[PDB]
């Protein structure tokens, strides 16, 4: 230990390059730092990362406790708890999920108690359409108009995989209707405050995306008109197809990079597949040592 060393991007910019991380000999200190990199610049690329799938979980839990994806399709076929998004086969078969993430969202932003802290450990990288779009959710509400932070002040948002949940391999030749149904037993559309108060930071979030959140209500639990939720995805950049916005960050890496980021604070969205060039990513997912925020 003693020999990582943190270059955080100026200012207010987003992002900070971490060197010389190891975390297999890493410092509590390093540890300490390096999380508080992720809360603060939101995300944390760790250079120079050569690791197999198993040196991989173990480097996230360096930093909380993993948790596997709830639907195994997506589960790597020797570490469980590692998310891979594949479109690269392999001896033909898939292996994980292709072209997930498709729309903007928080992970776990469909369940009642998500993870902090998302890890990306990217395989395959597209040599020109590489990287992921992100929006950072607390900068995103400070920029808001002031009466629009006041319409959303005490409301609650509805949350649900019901859009984007995947059709399975055992999923053939079941009616839609009976598989609709089954997501919203497995799981149910989760109820948050509209904003809540990042643990780690004190930042106030705005906690929507436009892939997962499906409705929002008043303080008194009645439904609101859904053109609140469009309003608020148009100001905070979520509608551009261009990504143009100013709220919007593209974040790039290269061979050997393992991106660390804050899933309270961020939402993110994979690129159009504007090339043919393939994807591969392995993903653990790790809760810290507080809850997403503390009404959880
Ligand atoms: C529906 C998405 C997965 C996918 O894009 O297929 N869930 C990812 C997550 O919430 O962590
Ligand atoms: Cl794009
Ligand atoms: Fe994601």
Same mark, same amino acid.
């Given at each position: 230990?003693?020999?990582? %060393?943190?270059? $955080?991007?100026?200012?207010?910019?987003?992002?900070?390059?971490? @060197?010389?991380?190891?975390?297999?000999?890493?410092?509590?200190?390093?540890?300490?730092?390096?999380?508080?990199?992720?809360?603060?610049?939101?995300?944390?690329?760790?250079?120079?990362?050569?690791?197999?799938?198993?040196?991989?979980?173990?480097?996230?839990?360096?930093?909380?406790?993993?948790? *596997?994806? /709830?639907?195994?399709? /997506?589960?790597?076929?020797?570490?469980?708890?590692?998310?891979?998004?594949?479109?690269?086969?392999?001896?033909?078969?898939?292996?994980?999920?292709?072209?997930?993430?498709?729309?903007? !969202? *928080?992970?776990?932003?469909?369940?009642?108690?998500?993870?902090?802290?998302?890890?990306?450990?990217?395989?395959?990288?597209?040599?020109?359409?590489?990287?992921?779009?992100?929006?950072?959710?607390?900068?995103?509400?400070?920029?808001?108009?002031?009466?629009?932070?006041?319409?959303?002040?005490?409301?609650?948002?509805?949350?649900?995989?019901?859009?984007?949940?995947?059709?399975?391999?055992?999923?053939?030749?079941?009616?839609?209707?009976?598989?609709?149904?089954?997501?919203?037993?497995?799981?149910?559309?989760?109820?948050?405050?509209?904003?809540?108060?990042?643990?780690?930071?004190?930042?106030?979030?705005?906690?929507?995306?436009?892939?997962?959140?499906?409705?929002?209500?008043?303080?008194? &639990?009645?439904?609101?008109?859904?053109?609140?939720?469009?309003?608020?995805?148009? *100001?905070?950049? %979520?509608?551009? @197809?261009?990504?143009?916005?100013?709220?919007? !960050?593209?974040?790039?890496? $290269?061979? &050997?990079?393992?991106?660390?980021?804050?899933?309270?604070?961020?939402?993110?969205?994979?690129?159009?597949?504007?090339?043919?060039?393939?994807?591969?990513?392995?993903?653990?997912?790790? !809760?810290?040592?507080?809850?997403? !925020?503390?009404?959880?």
């Amino acid at each position: 230990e003693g020999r990582m %060393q943190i270059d $955080e991007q100026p200012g207010n910019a987003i992002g900070a390059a971490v @060197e010389g991380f190891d975390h297999a000999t890493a410092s509590d200190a390093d540890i300490d730092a390096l999380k508080s990199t992720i809360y603060t610049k939101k995300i944390a690329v760790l250079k120079g990362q050569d690791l197999s799938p198993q040196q991989f979980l173990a480097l996230g839990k360096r930093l909380g406790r993993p948790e *596997a994806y /709830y639907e195994p399709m /997506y589960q790597h076929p020797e570490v469980t708890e590692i998310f891979v998004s594949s479109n690269v086969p392999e001896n033909g078969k898939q292996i994980g999920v292709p072209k997930t993430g498709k729309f903007w !969202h *928080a992970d776990y932003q469909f369940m009642p108690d998500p993870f902090g802290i998302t890890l990306i450990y990217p395989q395959v990288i597209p040599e020109k359409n590489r990287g992921t779009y992100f929006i950072d959710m607390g900068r995103a509400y400070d920029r808001l108009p002031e009466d629009l932070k006041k319409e959303i002040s005490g409301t609650y948002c509805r949350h649900s995989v019901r859009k984007y949940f995947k059709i399975r391999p055992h999923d053939v030749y079941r009616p839609i209707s009976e598989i609709i149904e089954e997501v919203e037993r497995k799981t149910p559309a989760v109820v948050q405050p509209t904003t809540f108060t990042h643990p780690m930071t004190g930042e106030t979030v705005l906690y929507i995306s436009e892939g997962f959140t499906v409705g929002i209500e008043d303080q008194d &639990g009645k439904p609101l008109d859904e053109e609140l939720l469009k309003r608020l995805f148009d *100001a905070t950049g %979520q509608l551009d @197809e261009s990504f143009e916005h100013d709220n919007i !960050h593209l974040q790039s890496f $290269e061979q &050997g990079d393992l991106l660390v980021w804050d899933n309270r604070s961020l939402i993110h969205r994979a690129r159009h597949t504007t090339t043919p060039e393939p994807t591969v990513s392995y993903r653990v997912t790790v !809760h810290d040592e507080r809850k997403l !925020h503390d009404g959880i």
